[PDB]
Amino acid sequence: MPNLCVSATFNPPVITMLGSALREETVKLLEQRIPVKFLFYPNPDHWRMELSQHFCDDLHKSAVFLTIIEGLEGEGWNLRASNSIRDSESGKDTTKLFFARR
Amino acid sequence: GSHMPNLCVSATFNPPVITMLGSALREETVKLLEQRIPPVKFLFYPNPDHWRMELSQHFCDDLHKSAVFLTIIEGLEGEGWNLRASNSIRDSESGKDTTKLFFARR
Amino acid sequence: GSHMPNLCVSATFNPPVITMLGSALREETVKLLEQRIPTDPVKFLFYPNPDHWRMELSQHFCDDLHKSAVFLTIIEGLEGEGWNLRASNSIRDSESGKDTTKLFFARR
Amino acid sequence: HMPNLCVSATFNPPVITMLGSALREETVKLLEQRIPTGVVKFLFYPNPDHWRMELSQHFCDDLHKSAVFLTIIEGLEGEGWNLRASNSIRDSESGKDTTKLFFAR
Ligand SMILES: [Cl-]
Ligand SMILES: [K+]
Ligand SMILES: [Mg+2]
Ligand SMILES: [Mg+2]
């Protein structure tokens, strides 16, 4: 029952990926397309990419989400849902994207 | 259907409070999720009929919230419940966030 | 083809106000939701420009659990009427203290 | 296999942006006519290539935001772009709310 969660918080950009069936080959493709590597950590198993020097405005956030969706679509992961919040105290926004296999 | 069968899972943090609503939700599916999420139980309340679990002691950071959502979605997928939509808000006054997950049969 | 129209249902709390937009929404569907949502009964009223139906639940406050129940009953009721849930989003307004959720539906 | 599309709407005042590598100008012009009608031009900018409309100097209330979303979704569906997901946030300091709609062929 393979699902994937991608979470993106801004700014600066921090992208997390969770899903037991996620391949390192897929992580590498997103590394290359999100225009600086994803580092793996266990418990829970996940990939993290932080771009500490970068600032993404609203349009660039839209662009990051498209590259993630498109990259994952080519690798057999289908977008099923998204949600987002903003934290007034930190000034950060966090978006989650949820994917499933076909 | 009576009301064609859908499910709503809502999760508020922190501390974690998980609620599960849906006419066709069986107690056996609630018991499977009880095991995956973590020895805390869902309690049943009526009107609206639903199951509530509170992890009074626990604190979930963003990564662990993502993990909770993923475990809920994967456990429900195996039970025949497909994720259709999600939404979320944060309350600045309380510092709590609430995410809702909507599921339908396959 | 064009294809079929879409539906947007929005709900703001509190107090609970439900609005429904969509050219192809039939009165029979509104009437079914009138009966399902509260569970003198409250009604949807029609207003033009933009054309929509509006219901307020009678001065209530709906806790987070009751908000989940309203959304489920809307989705379930519309699914039986041939409207399929495609997307949802929500925001909270810190200054009014109100939260708004949108549900978007397409024909099957 | 195909590029996806993101339409973002921020209020107020209402500003609509469209981002998608495969978006045709006829689609943009169709929305250009449908949006003010449901409630002036989309202008092209680079880096990344996108389309931007300042729909009005007048403020949209919640009902008119609903109506903008619906007219966008309906117009894009007729052009072969299917709604897959949405998300939204509100910024308390700026007082602006931003909604993103994601579409696929
Ligand atoms: Cl959302
Ligand atoms: K969806
Ligand atoms: Mg959503
Ligand atoms: Mg939100």
* Any C CB within 8 A of D97 CB: yes
- Structural contact between residues D87 and A93, judged by C-beta atoms closer than 8 angstroms: no
- Structural contact between residues A49 and B52, judged by C-beta atoms closer than 8 angstroms: no
Q: Measure the CA–CA gap between D4 and B64, rounded to whole angstroms.
A: 29
Structural determination approach:
X-ray
Is D88 annotated as a binding-site member?
A: yes
Contact D89 A93 (CB under 8 A): yes
- Smallest CA-to-CA distance from A69 within B102, D3, D89, D105 is with D3
Residue type, position B17, single letter: V
Q: Measure the CA–CA gap between A85 and B98, rounded to whole angstroms.
A: 9
DSSP letter assigned to residue D3: -
Which of D84, D90, D99 shows the shortest C-beta gap to C93? D90
* CA distances to A92, B66, C56, D68 from A13, in Å: 10, 17, 41, 30
Residues 6+ apart with CB under 8 A from D18: D5, D6, D7, D8, D28, D31, D42, D50, D51, D52
DSSP letter assigned to residue D62: H
3-state SS track over chain A: CCEEEEEEEECCCEEEEECCCCCHHHHHHHHHHCCCCCEEECCCCEEEEECCCCCCCHHHHHHHHHHHHHHHHHCCEEEEEEEEEEECCCCEEEEEEEEEEC
Exposure string (b/e) for D14-28, b if CB count within 10 Å is 16 or more? Answer: bbbbbbbeebeeebb
Contacts of D86 in chain C (CB under 8 A): 87-89, 102, 104
Say whether D28 sits in a helix, a strand or coil: helix
- Our CA-based measurement puts residue C103 at a distance from the nearest CA of chain B, in whole angstroms, of 9
- Our CA-based measurement puts residue D77 at a distance from the nearest CA of chain C, in whole angstroms, of 6
Give chains near B: 3+ CB pairs under 8 A: A, C, D
Contact C90 B88 (CB under 8 A): yes
Residues 6+ apart with CB under 8 A from C48: none
Residue A15 token pair: 């992208």
- Give the CA-trace dihedral at B86, C85, D26, A56, to 10 degrees: 0
Rg (CA), chain D: 13
Ligand 2 centre to CA of B87 (Å) is 10
Find the distance separating the first CA and the last CA of chain D, reported in whole Å: 9
How many residues appear in chain C? 108
For B89, phi then psi, to 5°, come to: -140, 160
Say whether D35 sits in a helix, a strand or coil: helix
Please say whether the dihedral angle defined by the alpha carbons of residues C17, B69, A89 and D60, taken in this order, is positive or negative.
negative
Q: Measure the CA–CA gap between A27 and B70, rounded to whole angstroms.
A: 18
- Structural contact between residues D17 and A65, judged by C-beta atoms closer than 8 angstroms: no
Report all structural domains of chain A as residue ranges with CATH numbers, in order of start. 3-101 (3.90.1150)
- Our CA-based measurement puts residue A41 at a distance from the nearest CA of chain D, in whole angstroms, of 28
Residues 6+ apart with CB under 8 A from A27: A17, A38, A40, A47
DSSP chain B: -TT--EEEEEEEETTTEEEEE-TT--HHHHHHHHHH-----PEEETTTTEEEEE-TT----HHHHHHHHHHHHHHHHHTTEEEEEEEEEE-TTT--EEEEEEEEE-
- Structural contact between residues A45 and A82, judged by C-beta atoms closer than 8 angstroms: no
Contact A83 B83 (CB under 8 A): no
- Structural contact between residues A61 and A84, judged by C-beta atoms closer than 8 angstroms: no
* Any C CB within 8 A of B75 CB: no
For C42, phi then psi, to 5°, come to: -80, 155
> Which residue is it, tokens 């979704």?
D73
DSSP C20-73: EE-TT--HHHHHHHHHHTT------EEETTTTEEEEE-SS----HHHHHHHHHH
DSSP letter assigned to residue D58: S
Residue type, position C37, single letter: I
Whether the upstream peptide bond of residue D36 has omega within 30° of 0, thus cis, is no
